Amino acid sequence: AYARTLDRAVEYLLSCQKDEGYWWGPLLSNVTMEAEYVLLCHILDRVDRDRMEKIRRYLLHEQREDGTWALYPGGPPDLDTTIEAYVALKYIGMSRDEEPMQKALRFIQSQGGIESSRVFTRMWLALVGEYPWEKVPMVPPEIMFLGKRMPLNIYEFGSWARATVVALSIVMSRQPVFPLPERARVPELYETDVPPRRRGAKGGGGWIFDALDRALHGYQKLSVHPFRRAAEIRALDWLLERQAGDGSWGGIQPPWFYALIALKILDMTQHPAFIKGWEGLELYGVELDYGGWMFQASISPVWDTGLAVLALRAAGLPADHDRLVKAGEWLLDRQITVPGDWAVKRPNLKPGGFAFQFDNVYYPDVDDTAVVVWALNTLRLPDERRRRDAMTKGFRWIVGMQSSNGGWGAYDVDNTSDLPNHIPFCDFGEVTDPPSEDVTAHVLECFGSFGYDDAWKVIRRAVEYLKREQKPDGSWFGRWGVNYLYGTGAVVSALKAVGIDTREPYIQKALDWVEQHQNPDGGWGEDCRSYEDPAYAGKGASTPSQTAWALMALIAGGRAESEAARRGVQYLVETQRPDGGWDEPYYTGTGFPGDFYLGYTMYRHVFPTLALGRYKQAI
Amino acid sequence: AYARTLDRAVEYLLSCQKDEGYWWGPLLSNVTMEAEYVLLCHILDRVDRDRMEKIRRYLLHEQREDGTWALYPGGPPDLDTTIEAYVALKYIGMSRDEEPMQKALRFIQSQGGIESSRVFTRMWLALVGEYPWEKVPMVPPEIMFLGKRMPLNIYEFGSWARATVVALSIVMSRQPVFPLPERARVPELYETDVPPRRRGAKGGGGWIFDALDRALHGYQKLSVHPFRRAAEIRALDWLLERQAGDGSWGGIQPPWFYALIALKILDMTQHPAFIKGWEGLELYGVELDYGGWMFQASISPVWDTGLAVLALRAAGLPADHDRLVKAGEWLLDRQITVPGDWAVKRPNLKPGGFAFQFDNVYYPDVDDTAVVVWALNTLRLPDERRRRDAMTKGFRWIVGMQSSNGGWGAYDVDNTSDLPNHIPFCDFGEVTDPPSEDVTAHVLECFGSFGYDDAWKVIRRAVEYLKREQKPDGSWFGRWGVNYLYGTGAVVSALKAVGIDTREPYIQKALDWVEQHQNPDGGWGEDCRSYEDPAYAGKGASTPSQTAWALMALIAGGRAESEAARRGVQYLVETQRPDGGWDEPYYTGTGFPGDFYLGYTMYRHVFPTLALGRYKQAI
Ligand SMILES: CN(C/C=C/COc1ccc(C(=O)c2ccc(Br)cc2)cc1)C1CC1
Ligand SMILES: CN(C/C=C/COc1ccc(C(=O)c2ccc(Br)cc2)cc1)C1CC1
Ligand SMILES: CCCCCCCCOCCOCCOCCOCCO
Ligand SMILES: CCCCCCCCOCCOCCOCCOCCO
After folding, report:
1. Catalytic residues per the record (chains A, B)?
2. Can B1-26+299-619 and B27-298 be said to share one CATH topology?
3. Chain A residue numbers touching B245 (CB-CB < 8 A)
4. Which CATH number fits domain B27-298: 3.30.1360.70, 1.10.10.10, 1.50.10.20, 3.30.70.20?
5. What separation in angstroms does the CA of A515 have from each of A477, A509, A519, A586, B460?
6. CATH of region B1-26+299-619
């Protein structure tokens, strides 16, 4: 029955693999990427008429009937995302008269206009001269003077936010303005009677910071800022030292873009760092068959490759399958061997982790590391030497990354400060990188493959962490994946691996929860709204990935030979395409709960296969 | 008579010009470049068998019958140069038995062996483990803490020495060792009964520095060096901020090589800076028709282009000659507009100078700037706007670069410290960049083209400087050119331009000096030995360039219609080749008096033309 499904799913994944021997599916987000890119080109004075076209088709194509744009497909209209898309289009050529512009402008005004947008949005508009810098949260270069152990030092923020802060400190230090031609001016973003509904700091704002900010803007108007020069250089150098091999900065859109602007401000357009940083952008771009063009918020070659292997293995292919070997080999040349920012908290820890993208040595993450090591432990490479050695290095690194609460973070250790969550500037997405259930789970299952059970203290500490985090309904939150089905599926699958007794109460209470949300069509689904409204927790249209996750939870809990079990398997078998793939018009990935969502292209093919592979194991 | 000579010389230069519209002749030096490059590859673990071959052919080809190598063609054997060539060859494959190696080893031992070599030589050998670091002058990273106005701060050294010191401070901080395979070990460099004849600091050594050094080596053995870490980073950042656009550092061989090694020591082989720096090397390499390969100590595209223009103009071609326009345009896109290290002494000076090579924004020099501006002032470009503006910027910059003594340096202002000349480390070539007669002269002649005469104070201050520097025999020293004929030719030509009366006494005393050295064959020549022995002052085999220089001095002094005058002109006319070019088996360029000599490929074609052009003007 499901056999043909697997066989078809397998040959498909094998056809997606590149020559080098890795997998790499595009990462979807929202139009703010492309929109901001347009503004960036304007800033760097490097506009390409041809590209603009492709970007225009894209923007319109992603606009809904109401004339707005959302964070995820089928999601509510987003003000910020729309405002930025509006500005972008108008710059390219669109006239405020054309319908697309009209319906968009409407929604924008019905929300209070630009005064209701996030910080970044107002900041970008400030860079082009459509908004006063004075009304933008200030972030001084002096922040570079804070010591390793001081309130608000760059190392208390998340790896992703850190670089951004450093880059912007230079930008906000000079508060440059790159005027837009008259035809592009967007004053209409102000014309609104609706009261401005501003968004506050993530964890709430304190009058202290509020005052401090007001002070900073004041100190900004003075005629002399002692030691500011040094502060700027401190930031410039910080950036120059961590620039990624591909020319990026962290492998993410934000810091990369701001770093370039910063360099432009310091008249360093003819400096290697800049040149490389600029031309490196193309690698993240993507040509769309309908004439459009998009910019990936980030790339997941390693991540995809890793899962893809574990999927094909659990499917059936030999541990020494010549094709899977290519992957193994490839994955070995990716391992990092130099210290990263994580070393600031673990100076005596030996490098050995892996990154999300191709070349990003200074920012390896636990999640990727775990999956890559785990994936290798299931293969038979020609040179058992480096394979054995590699796993060892990565293994140890992961262990040394374990936080205090026994849980694991993504990039840093005990990065659980709370101060940054109250700063005026931080009002969008996460700002810190605390331990998460999903990451932890992946780690445990990684060790499990080796054998390390509940006996080992490290494992126990983690298990306890998970137990204390479990939700009342017996489910587990999903940090980097949408959502409770993602997390619960991870935990259970992990706990099962570490030797824990699947018969346990809290465990069962979880499995039951899964079955209770199985949609009528036999599959599982969870809309991204589950991050805003708890009512959607476990609710949503059925998707190949989410269905596979909830499926793994059951197969792991022994309920593989159950009704809901076989039921879900039926879904995957039917919904499968003639080529052996799967479709998924919805996002199942998460960047920042309630603020940024991702669309993992490979998920729809990988997980479904991994699930069917594990189901064929229970029988 | 000389007409045909000119017409042939012109069409030749025009055939050398590249498509872009510039000239670029290879720069010759000595085998230490290629030799050290081989060691560098060994260090960076990037040896290319094929390249090694080409490098071997070169080395042997440059070896004389006695089995040695010299700084300049026809010069005495050099210990350092030979030792490095010896080591290089042995690493490539040569056995110490083969004749070439034998005769070389001889000369080396007859000089006291490795103990008699310069600092760098012993240092390189120390990097490969053939010499103890303990016996190598120490240079601490802490040197980075010295303030702008303190004894021995990095800004008291010459631009060329500065970067080198910064890079090496990191290297000597870790004192790394990259062992050579047994077959390459060169212990024979010690086997010698001859007493070691060590070379001391350039300006003599003081027991202070001697003691200070002994102290530094002691502090180097301690278990804890407080703040050294910061010191290292201070250097790393300094380097990362000034890396040239082509990936080099200053556009010269030394710092470029050491910067790479330094980055290798800090495990930054996967950092953009390194990558760019490594692949950038190829641009300086050169394929030799006989199968050899050499590495240029530096490149002179701008310099060649500049002179080439002034030459063709003085020759006859129209100020708007479509071909010369290409040059003009090209030269305009080269002008620098950002601050360089020179700004540390002139913070309120507006950028506008030019560099020696293609892309080297942080290190423009007065000599190039002057010549480039002067060259432009003789052309009629389509966009008179940028031409007028460019000249203005460059003009002003030059003026703001004038030193105290009324003279002009090369890269910095009043870079006349004396402390660095006594440090143990500095025992090869110049270490500071004080004002020179030749540079100054070029500057004066640059202003002259505009009209500014002796009336202007700036001009007077310079003229006085020249008068006070003139040698007893009425000649002028040649800093960046070999030598007295080069300098005297420059000064006189300049003074004539600034309106000074050519009939003056000191002037005449100079012209006479010129005529007095005219070789029998009618031409002029000055061997590089003139820097060691004053007896060779003005003596040496006749060369196209030197003959042209002494010729300009006469033509400028009004003695154009003289015997010696017409005599020299005859030489150039006869010695000219069928293609219209000229040969010159000798070096006429100077890097460091008595230590480093250069071979400017274009000189033999440019100056001879410029001379004939100015002779055709006097008639
Ligand atoms: C390492 N893990 C989890 C992390 C995945 C990466 O996810 C992203 C990717 C990009 C962004 C932004 O572009 C962004 C946009 C706006 C701002 Br403000 C900042 C960053 C954000 C998050 C791998 C195994 C799955
Ligand atoms: C700007 N002017 C004058 C300067 C010319 C440049 O000349 C050089 C070039 C290279 C070197 C070294 O490689 C060197 C080798 C060994 C050490 Br130790 C340091 C540097 C040295 C000098 C132009 C108009 C003519
Ligand atoms: C990073 C702060 C930018 C403000 C300083 C730039 C002004 C240049 O100062 C001149 C000092 O001499 C150093 C020059 O080399 C410049 C490269 O450093 C990069 C740009 O700051
Ligand atoms: C330049 C001093 C050499 C010390 C480097 C050891 C690295 C210590 O890790 C610190 C953590 O910060 C991350 C740095 O890696 C970025 C590049 O900085 C250059 C050399 O590491």
Report:
1. 367 (proton donor)
2. yes
3. 270-272, 275
4. 1.50.10.20
5. 17, 10, 9, 21, 96
6. 1.50.10.20
